[PDB]
Amino acid sequence: NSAAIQEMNREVEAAAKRTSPVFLTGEAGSPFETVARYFHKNGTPWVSPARVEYLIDMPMELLQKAEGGVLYVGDIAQYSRNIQTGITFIIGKAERCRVRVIASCSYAAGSDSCEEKLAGLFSESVVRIPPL
Amino acid sequence: GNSAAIQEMNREVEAAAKRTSPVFLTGEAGSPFETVARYFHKNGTPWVSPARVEYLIDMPMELLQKAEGGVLYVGDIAQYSRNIQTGITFIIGKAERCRVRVIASCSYAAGSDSCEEKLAGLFSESVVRIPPLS
């Protein structure tokens, strides 16, 4: 309903149009799962690992379970660099397996560097050239 | 050369040097985009740049072939049409398997004044920000 919710809903419409990962960001305690679910289509898989270690131990099993659906990897704010690297492996295979990868990243209220974690999962690099 | 804003810029360059995915350079009109893009060039590998912008939609495989093991520098996208931008996306999606690294720039009017819509269109994910509730 809000004006902030309006803009957000614009970001989810732009996202709806693609097959690449969606990254949800917001304050600790945000409704991450309900927004992630806006990308779920009825009668397709919605897979979320029962345990975090599954992201590195059984990435292929999760991609298979999730075929034509979504692999929701959860909130990365407290994931180790290892799991983060696991997610990158899953990201680079998901298209082929026809899985859409969704991740969240929560941060402390008061906008407290999810950005370092997200930049590592993003599939490109940005370098900003200052004025001379 | 030297300053504190550069120092950071060079942080962004080093983090980028560590990867095979695209690199996107952003900065004001008249930035040395090409000299910075060239920091990712390794000696003896191809440095390929389309002589014509339309080559990006007309002959994407030819450019990827020329650039194998090197870089395809696609140029400054600030005034590229939606079509060309979609051409770059097609090229981005094949570059890895062809062992080509894609580099793009986007320039904006001085000041620091929607490069962001072009770039986010060539970015290989989407970000949705959930505002505070309660």
Distance CA B123, CA A24 (A): 15
- Residue A119: count other Cβ atoms within 10 Å of its Cβ: 14
Chain mean position to CA B99: 16
Conformational region of residue A110, where left means phi above 0, alpha means psi within -120 to 50, and beta covers everything else = left
Secondary structure in 3-state letters for chain B: CCCHHHHHHHHHHHHHHCCCCCEEEEEECCCCHHHHHHHHCCCCCCEECCCCCCHHHHCHHHHHHHCCCCEEEEEECCCCCHHHHHHHHHHHHHHCCCCCEEEEEEEECCCCCCCHHHHHHHCCCEEEEECCCC
| Per-residue buried b or exposed e for A35-65, using 16+ beta carbons within 10 Å of the residue's own CB | bbeebeeeeebbbbbeebebbbeebeebbeb
In this complex, the residue of B3, B31, B123 whose CB is nearest that of residue A124 is B123
Chain mean position to CA A27: 15
CATH code for the domain in which residue A28 is found? 3.40.50.300
Are residues B24 and A109, on separate chains, in Cβ contact within 8 Å? no
Are residues A23 and B127, on separate chains, in Cβ contact within 8 Å? yes
Which position has the token pair 């930035």? B31
Distance (Å) from the alpha carbon of A52 to chain B's nearest alpha carbon: 22
Distance CA B77, CA A61 (A): 40
Distance CA A74, CA A106 (A): 10
Which domain, by its residues, includes A47? 1-132
The CA angle A68-A114-A67, to the nearest 5 degrees, is 10
Are residues A129 and B22, on separate chains, in Cβ contact within 8 Å? no
Experimental method: X-ray
Nearest to A126 by CA among B84, B104, B51: B104
Nearest to B128 by CA among A74, A123, A15: A15
Are residues B130 and A24, on separate chains, in Cβ contact within 8 Å? yes
Find the DSSP H helices in A17-128: 32-36, 54-57, 59-65, 81-97, 115-121
Q: What is the resolution of this structure in A?
A: 2.4
Q: Beta partners for B64?
A: none
Q: Beta partners for B48?
A: B72
Nearest to A117 by CA among A106, A126, A129, A128: A106
Q: What are the backbone angles phi and psi of residue B68, rounded to the nearest 5°? A: -55, 130
Contact B20, A124 (CB under 8 A): no
Six token digits for residue A95: 């298209």
Q: Beta partners for A103?
A: A23
Q: Considering just the CA atoms, what is the radius of gyration of chain A in Å?
A: 15
Give chain A's domain count.
1
Distance (Å) from the alpha carbon of A14 to chain B's nearest alpha carbon: 8
The one-letter amino acid at A80 = S
Nearest to B54 by CA among B74, B79, B82, B84: B84
Sheet holding A22-27, edge to edge: A46-47, A70-75, A100-107, A22-27, B126-130
Distance CA B88, CA B82 (A): 10
Distance CA B126, CA A15 (A): 6
Distance CA B5, CA B10 (A): 9
The one-letter amino acid at B129 = R
The CA angle A62-A68-A72, to the nearest 5 degrees, is 45
Six token digits for residue B83: 């079509």
Six token digits for residue A10: 């614009």
Which position has the token pair 């990308």? A39
Q: What's the number of CA atoms in the CB half-sphere (13 Å) around residue B9?
A: 20
Are residues B130 and A14, on separate chains, in Cβ contact within 8 Å? no
Which residues in chain B have their CB less than 8 angstroms from residue A37's CB?
Answer: none
Contact A40, A69 (CB under 8 A): yes
Which residues in chain B have their CB less than 8 angstroms from residue A24's CB?
Answer: 127-130
